[PDB]
Amino acid sequence: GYDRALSIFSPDGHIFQVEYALEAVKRGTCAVGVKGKNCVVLGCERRSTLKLQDTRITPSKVSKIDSHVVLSFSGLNADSRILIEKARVEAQSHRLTLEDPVTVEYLTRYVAGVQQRYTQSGGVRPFGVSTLIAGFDPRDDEPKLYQTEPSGIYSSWSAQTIGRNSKTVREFLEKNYDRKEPPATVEECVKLTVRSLLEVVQTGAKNIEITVVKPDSDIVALSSEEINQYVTQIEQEK
Amino acid sequence: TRCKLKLLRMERIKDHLLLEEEFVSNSEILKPFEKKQEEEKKQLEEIRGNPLSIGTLEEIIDDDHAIVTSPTMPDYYVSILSFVDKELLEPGCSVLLHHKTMSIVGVLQDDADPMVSVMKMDKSPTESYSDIGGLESQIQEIKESVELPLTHPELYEEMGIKPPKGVILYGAPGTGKTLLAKAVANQTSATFLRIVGSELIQKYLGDGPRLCRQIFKVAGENAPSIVFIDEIDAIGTKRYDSNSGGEREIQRTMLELLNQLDGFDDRGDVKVIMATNKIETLDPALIRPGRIDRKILFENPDLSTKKKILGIHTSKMNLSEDVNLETLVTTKDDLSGADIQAMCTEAGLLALRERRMQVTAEDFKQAKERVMKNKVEENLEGLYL
Amino acid sequence: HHTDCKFIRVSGAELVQKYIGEGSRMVRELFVMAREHAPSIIFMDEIDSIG
Amino acid sequence: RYDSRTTIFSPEGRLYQVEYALESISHAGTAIGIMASDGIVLAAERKVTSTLLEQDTSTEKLYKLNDKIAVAVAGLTADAEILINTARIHAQNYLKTYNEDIPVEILVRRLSDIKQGYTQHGGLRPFGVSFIYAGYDDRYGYQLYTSNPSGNYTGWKAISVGANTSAAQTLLQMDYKDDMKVDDAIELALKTLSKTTDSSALTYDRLEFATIRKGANDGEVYQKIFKPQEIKDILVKTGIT
Amino acid sequence: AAFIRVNGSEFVHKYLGEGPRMVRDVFRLARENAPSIIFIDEVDSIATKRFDAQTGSDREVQRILIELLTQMDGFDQSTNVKVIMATNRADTLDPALLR
Ligand SMILES: Nc1ncnc2c1ncn2[C@@H]1O[C@H](COP(=O)(O)OP(=O)(O)OP(=O)(O)O)[C@@H](O)[C@H]1O
């Protein structure tokens, strides 16, 4: 329809360039976020293209922007790469101003901000990347999970999934999850993430990657061995 | 083998004995009535001479005359008289004159066109009902709007009102839509017309709507009848020419449909099925209800459903030697039933390289990889990576 | 030549029909001719530069 | 239809212009890196040649961007030329500021942004260049990467770009060895280059070669571009000539 | 050598079945007193890329074209030179009259 250009509106009121931007997100690897009460776990599919691909120097799908906020992406990998760097200059700059580390609520606005800006204008295309930003505040210890989307609209979810057959993981999540009691133990919450990611890999225990953020600037990336034990618990019970 | 024979036992004897009967009986039919029937033959013969000059009937005036226009060219002011009635004569019919004085001696002819061949199908499908297996919740939906008000009108007067008119089958490719139209029409034994919507575009300008008049002129005489317009998605951006089909025609063909299917004409008692792979391509007023009523949406068959569809295809096949059949289904997620028919196609192709006549379990696993590789492009994970 | 089929080349042409005179409703006709002279190979060349 | 400018997407969330830019690559010759723990060979093939094309006085598909990182080029050489200058300028900027020869990662990541940037902003054309980055940094040792024209990167143990990408990749991974030798790595590059390339005899003059090694005298990093005669001799050894 | 001659409006159908009779005349005659040359001066009426054939006026010309093709195929391997012909445009030609 009115995809010939970005600035022109549409009888249907939907800017097509944003809608197609979403569609692009499904290209990239699945990423899932699940919050606990004392944890957030941020896991992502790390899809292996060939067996010649290094694990020596090849980028992880999960990138720390600052020392207590964590970020995964789903989308156009090319585009994500500058989006993550722009996020980061501001993030660090947040301390230049205030002499306070980066608050997760200020950070989601900013990431949505660079994106909103690109959409508003006409002489740039939007980012084809939806991101999940997980983290805790510096001041406090309650777990926080945010999303940005291409459009420049941001939300908070309890648990949320994006990229590569996102729908099927989303439904899976609803059924398993409880909002009355989110899991209050880091391990059980991890396990919920692994079960999700299992589905989209079909088979892999060397293609599931798990990262965790915990409060007070604890961020850790999990051993490939450690994830396989969790897969071992999930295959036996099934 | 011995199960096949039980079926083969009835089939041979009964029809071949009827054949032997009919052969002897050609003579025998004449013998009980040969003085009403040959009496009638005599009187028929006497008035009409030879030859019987065929003309084509323009129109009758109801008073015992008609105006005919022969193919041999002269027009004649005939009489409707003798072995012919006013109800048997309707425009476009081909009437029988006696040569030496044109008196209408009968009508024995209505169709001989090449055109009507197109619309009709001399069909024999290799999959009939209950090889639509699975998605059964939604086959139940096409039944209610096609099959079951033909089969019992009882139910649709017990509820009162009209039986719902038509349907649109629409969704992703591979979801078994084609096989539905052909198989619900197997059940009913109604006249299955079939025309494609890439054959509703014409390479002559303004003949496109004349063709669309032909589809429900045909439907209405051979009724009760099931008109399949297959792929009416090809109306929105697929067209043969531009300076001898053009933009005017594409819109006109759709205007034409409106008048056929719920215009004055109304043309009650034609069940219409439209398969279209996208309903957001289709015209807003042709997806108006009360000419196609409710829409049935299909989606890439779900994980339990693809068990059904795998059993339909591998019933033909010689089965898996080790068995991994139940795990094939599991690996597939968000995938078509056409992937299943392309997988048993692909298993026996790998088998076909050997030109072995068996099929083993291991061919299955290979064949799934082969055909998944074909689907995914090198610029998808080029664009992305 | 091996299978013993008439190689009938089709192309959408207006020359292969003296009756309808176009290749749009000669798709139906193709099947009935090829059915008399079976087995057959239908070579519908999609040249997509012919017209 | 959607084969226009860069702001616009296709309704399938494809930017046609990145997809075409990929396809640009296989209209310039094959280029192969094979990583080994003894060194990296970079080997390349000429897109075309004639009998009076001079190609023994200079390279033009192997450029040093600095004294420890060098690149093989496949694709439009015009698009390549500007990006090589920008890479090299940055390589020395890093030198001036930190007193270390630039890490392989920082240099690939920079150029991935730049390629991405010409697609994303304005009306400017995307780039249709694949550079195989082969470097040393004292963090990760030996490193191979390649960057898409799309403006992203992946690390490799072997990669092929340029013409005949699929076949050249297949023969490489078929005979690849995990530890390898530098000497074997050079041999496997001629073996593949023979079958993929439609030149009748594989001549020294259709080859450029450079090797980056720290095992040709330790303590130091030695970049050894092969001269025509060295190339000419090693064909003999492998018995193609 | 003998020189012959028509134009496609000398294959004018102004009586029914006139026009195909001309095709048979020129070619049979050429064979007979071979070596020979048939000239068809312009063929922009016979050489029409498309046709209708939904009326009588086409079908007579269409039959001329089809008969024209048939006799050139027979014509091969004779010591005649095969038809000289000329056209105006370059897309008068059928993929059938050029094959
Ligand atoms: N639920 C099912 N039961 C049995 N077979 C199935 C089922 N669904 C799909 N199939 C098989 O998949 C084949 C391919 O699908 P089919 O030709 O019917 O297409 P479609 O979804 O109408 O696509 P389009 O109309 O867009 O071309 C069917 O002919 C049938 O063999």
Ligand SMILES: [Mg+2]
């Ligand atoms: Mg179909």
